[PDB]
Homo-oligomer: 427 residues x 4
């Protein structure tokens, strides 16, 4: 019967944000569909010690509306622990607590529909809207949802280098780490492959028990250094509306060349952790020479499993321009995630703007179609820059989505916060 | 004419808090009276570098209700700078910003009445309520306000030692520092007298320009050391409902001895600042021997002004048990504040419970009468302990006041926040 | 045959300091006797994470003589790791590294005699000097050493409350913790009793594994709070020659009343650790209500072992003035150490100045006799104040010992470093 | 008359280091020549608040020999303040203190010859050694020094963009900042041009008094961001012998591309300072909109002085690829320093190995001749990488110089300090 103003497909932290922000808006009928039974965010990398890299004000709502009851501070109050959080005096939430908070919010909301796997989406020429075919996971029932606008907040999927595909059975991706940790620690050697925060957290986790179990503990990365995530406040001003307006110079190549070489700004390791790793190598080394190796500049060219019972990683050191091999029993592939458009998007291919490399040619308002109806959350890294996976700019993006969806500026979008001037400007 | 559910007398940060918390409550008609023309908090000490000692969640409302539009985060949002505050990533507001924030809140509110000096309060036996006689400061106009309940957020007054009263004209209390700074810095010698955060902030401020002007810069304190404010997280659990219950059940004599021995918990200097002062003495000393003196254990016994154009401070070093004199032109008296019950309370003396030392015998719900009608904000240090001047426990206190005023629990009041157990407690 | 200028009895870090400082002094013939086979300092509290509470410049020599080859910096250089230490950029040595450093120094020195248990000391009226009777631990051989002066750097011994003596067999002192940890963690409940750094380190160690094993983890202390060690720089000026001169007001009672109530200055917990404990309680509590109890103001009045298989601690909460009981299976008594004069001192009792409570009536130059010949290192807390167990004032004390022993001021003693004036002073 | 084992020309912190390290070596007769009257290091940038970017163990000697009496810790001891330094508990010396320390060392040494400008150097074929012709700055007297080996610690010179040369009289280089500060602060507008630590320190210094004087305070940089100096400990392992060996084996073209892409490793701003600048902009902005501008990606293409009494900076924003102009009265050119071989090196051109770009083809032992006799301190950035201006690798370099000069290894030279492996390396 009744057409929705928008349907959100996927309830990651971004669409969960949109949901908290959209619920109290007058005359906005929106619904969110997810296939899982509840919210559960990236639980394979929930080590006890792990925090977010982002202060708590980058919760679901506060940067758009601090008065929202879905705030992290309000959560803390309802759980009856806000004074403890006050005494803690720490800007950075534990991942476990953020996950608990997101679950509390998802439970409180009314506009979420869990256990709803979207199977196909199509544009109905006769009704002039989008038709979303779902399947209820608990009952099997088929249902169709009508909507003027879609907002695609699907997650990305685990990614390993192309040459590793034949050994998926042996190595463990970061996402499978916690489950296979006990099995890894029984091995003679472990190698973490990858540059980011996940790799570092894992490396630190294993380094903790290097004296307790046998293992050699290696870390190989393509990155030129173990670079920290750049957190100096003048650079943080680049994660801003003003910079994003600037960044829409509109020259795509520049954008793509900028995104390689701005990796300090989004793909870095938390500075504290790099230093904690050095300090732990130092402390462990007091009992004897440690059996560790750490390489940089190193691309994985090929790999192979030997009868011996070991991997042989062929590596290319790009700076030196010289190839070399390394061996390991255990292999943790902390190579992160890649977004690729979900199966259901096949049904609206001709309605989507694609760029030269067959990804979404995303517009400034986060839209993927030719009429401001199909929007995307995350997966605009190539055209909106390093700011896209940031929870800190979730409220910004959600606020402009709500502006497009509803016509009005529902949440005011702060477009002059920064001391710098980014574009050229004469006097 | 119309009887109020409660009247707040005084609009400091505590009653301004109560005001933000009470405004949206259904079936609560409250009003707040203050004699000043607007909110303007401790502007003599409002130095550019000065922060609050307390994270921003101890704003007017957040610890009772983070969704309130009077929150510091909402203020930051409406001013259009929340992202800058996010980048700053600092828990501690500048005093200048807190003051700007409190002013914004006071402006937004409807329940505040400025320029209204309360002159007398009395209990009307026939109407069975309190009668508050005010005077408009600008026009002189008399008005009477009727109310079932009062909440006294009058605040404490600046205090200097008894022997200093004859020289009020020459020395400067910390509260008047910024107005007299330029006049102090022209002098040959300045002496900060007192141990607290204000003393230290002033000492640091003056030490910054010791190179630039002539002055000798002295610091004398009665305190045994320049003790820091204890800010380790296990001690912060003592600023909790459970500790306050514990403290309030301890005999009257015990509580007073606790308040004199627990000055590191509330009357201390922020440890960063103590260290910044040492580091600045170190850096300044690289150009020559500094002209500074710092004494401890030293009680001011007497003072006097000489024809020469100098004070002579007579001091007694209590540990050594030996007297000595010191000289100074400028004198900053950073000796803090003392509460004494305001003039208007004379009219309800018979209705107030007094303890053995003629102060309010305050009950656990912050009430001073025999019927839960006259409440106090920040005059219960002697019965509720070191947590009383804390902005961090303003929402707690306001939340229990609102529970008494309106019989329901309007904002949830934690009974238990802490991992420690303070009172004795047997197992099984 | 030949009389020594001084003999040091005991080679703790204090006499080991004196030894490094005395070795290069011209015309000073001194020797140091210890019963153990080498240096090994307080190895029961060497947890991996534990640091000293004192910057590395408070090593054996640097505050008296930074050019000494026994410096921590020189140690780091000879081991070939000084650049690593530079990158670490941490003032506070790991206890394990300090111990390794002290061992390196002890090995390099020539004036140390290990495996030499002093059995008796006496004053020879005819030779007019001290006669020290030793026993070689490896060979059994008796030997006598002659000396004009003695410097007693014996360690203190483990101490538990008087009421605990009948249960020495069941509870574990902090010094026995590492050995009994595995046995403690199998129990249903553990209780750390005591206020200091040791108690806190242990509490943190056990709290780490509270989710992994069953246990209830309690902490009871007589202290009014879990007070931190006061490290603010204006208070650190009280650990200074100028303050020590002041502190010799000469009124003993004041000194004794000062030493209770100056416990923040020497008996505190490192601030970082208190906060790390709060932060870890916070993180653990995310999985469920934690089974922990923490009491303060609580004196242990009596204890008893029940047939049930549990201790019953009777406690008195001194502030509230109310008694209460608590139960626990495991009991870690982190009640620290007490010095008492060693057996051999019996032979020179009449030559030693004793005060009203039968401890050494120590003079300003650290001497215990009536002629500036018998000196003591540590064990002058009652008359020199909170500064005495500090490694930071080891060089100061050693420098004044060398001044008394040799007559000359061998190492200059810095007597005007402090911005404050401590005594009364008119103008 | 007497032939020296080596002569050091220039007494910067590097050759002053070599001097302290060489003095106690048996059978080493060395002497050091400098044209100035004493040691006085970068006094235009010696602001009260300014620290070194490098822990105190990177003093003149400690990383080669902590027992040396020229150590910073020994200095502190002789001055009678080591306990104060212990209480300070800060790894980073104030520049003023480092300067005082270097002066104390220079005074204690015997092997330094001040007021001695080297004018020409030549190789004597018959004596088989180097002949160094000096001129006494005070008296004009000529002297010739003979030596088997030279070590050139001349240092780099202040550098401004090519288009600025006609206005040297009006703008101020960072090196002349403290002398011209009072004159800058009288102006209506000031513009700091440049990205580095000096620029930032100056910008912070001026921002402090933006309230007090009129000025507009601008900051323009060619750099893409105000990048911090990378100080995370895994990256600090790149300042190591193993990394330097790795760097020096990379083809000439590769090394030059590395030195332009690795400016965060040596030409960055201290992260505390970047954040202190943001925090100070934040605090100042509480009184009104600040009159500041900050541009990035901006190359200075041209400049010109107008009759009005102002510069007009023409800038090109390289990322956007768009030109724009800006105006300023005061101009601080914080564009750093460049090495170019001093005049005297003309006389030994034929004896020096030159690379494809006419700079010294420096060998791994820091030598520039074909026989391990002419060495350089801090002119090998193009062949030994980003670690060259680091005081932290001064003792390393001095230790290998001493090994070449005297054939024995006088101070032990680490081959391997780091947990990482930088070059490719196969297993078995
Ligand atoms: C310089 C300074 C800094 C401080 N900083 C902090 C901090 O960072 N964090 C923290 O937790 N605590 C701090 N404190 C402690 C505490 O927060 C303050 O003392 C606070 O102002 C006290 O609260 P109040 O409501 O009593 O305030 P007050 O400012 O005393 O408010 C009282 C108001 O009532 C009015 N009044 C009095 N009598 C009458 C009458 N008869 N009729 C009408 N109006 C009347 C007064 O004019 C005034 O406006 C600080 C104190 C000082 C002095
Ligand atoms: C403001 C500033 C701060 C810095 N701070 C740090 C820091 O904290 N940490 C760090 O690691 N690095 C720092 N650096 C980088 C580096 O340490 C300095 O550039 C250093 O001064 C360079 O070493 P030098 O030996 O070349 O010194 P210089 O000071 O350049 O010494 C050269 C000397 O040789 C003399 N000379 C030149 N030609 C002749 C001649 N023909 N005859 C006689 N004498 C001659 C000069 O007069 C001068 O006295 C800083 C640089 C600057 C500009």
């Amino acid at each position: 019967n009744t057409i929705y103003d928008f349907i959100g497909i996927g309830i990651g932290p971004f669409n969960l944000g949109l949901a908290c922000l959209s619920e109290p808006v007058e005359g906005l009928n929106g619904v969110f569909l997810d296939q899982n039974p509840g919210f559960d965010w990236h639980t394979g990398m929930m080590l006890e010690s792990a925090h977010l890299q982002t202060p708590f004000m980058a919760d679901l709502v506060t940067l758009a509306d601090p008065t929202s009851p879905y705030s992290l501070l309000n959560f803390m109050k309802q759980k009856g622990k806000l004074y403890s959080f006050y005494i803690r005096e720490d800007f950075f939430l534990m991942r476990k607590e953020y996950n608990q908070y997101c679950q509390w919010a998802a439970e409180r909301l009314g506009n979420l529909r869990w256990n709803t796997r979207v199977e196909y989406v199509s544009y109905d020429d006769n009704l002039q809207c989008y038709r979303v075919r779902s399947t209820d996971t608990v009952s099997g029932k088929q249902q169709e949802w009508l909507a003027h606008r879609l907002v695609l907040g699907t997650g990305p999927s685990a990614w390993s280098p192309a040459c590793s595909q034949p050994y998926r059975e042996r190595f463990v991706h970061s996402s499978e780490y916690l489950l296979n940790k006990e099995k890894l620690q029984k091995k003679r050697s472990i190698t973490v492959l990858g540059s980011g925060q996940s790799a570092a957290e894992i490396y630190y986790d294993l380094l903790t028990d290097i004296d307790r179990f046998g293992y050699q503990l290696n870390w190989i990365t393509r990155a030129p250094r173990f670079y920290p995530l750049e957190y100096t406040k003048l650079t943080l001003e680049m994660t801003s509306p003003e910079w994003i307006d600037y960044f829409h110079s509109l020259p795509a190549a520049k954008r793509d060349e900028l995104n390689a070489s701005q990796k300090n700004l989004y793909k870095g390791i938390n500075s504290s952790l790099i230093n904690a790793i050095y300090d732990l190598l130092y402390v462990k080394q007091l009992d004897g020479k440690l059996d560790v190796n750490l390489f940089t500049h190193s691309e994985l060219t090929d790999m192979r499993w030997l009868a011996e019972g070991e991997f042989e990683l062929k590596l290319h050191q790009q700076e030196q321009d010289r190839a070399y091999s390394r061996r390991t029993e255990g292999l943790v592939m902390a190579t992160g995630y890649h977004y690729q458009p979900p199966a259901f998007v096949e049904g609206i291919q001709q309605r989507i703007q694609w760029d030269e490399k067959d990804r979404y040619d995303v517009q400034r308002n986060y839209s993927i179609d030719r009429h401001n109806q199909v929007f995307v959350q995350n997966a605009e890294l190539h055209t909106h820059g390093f700011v896209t996976p940031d929870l800190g700019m979730a409220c910004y993006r959600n606020s402009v989505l709500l502006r497009e969806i509803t016509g009005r500026e529902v949440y005011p979008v702060e477009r002059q916060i920064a001391f710098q001037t980014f574009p050229a400007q004469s006097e």
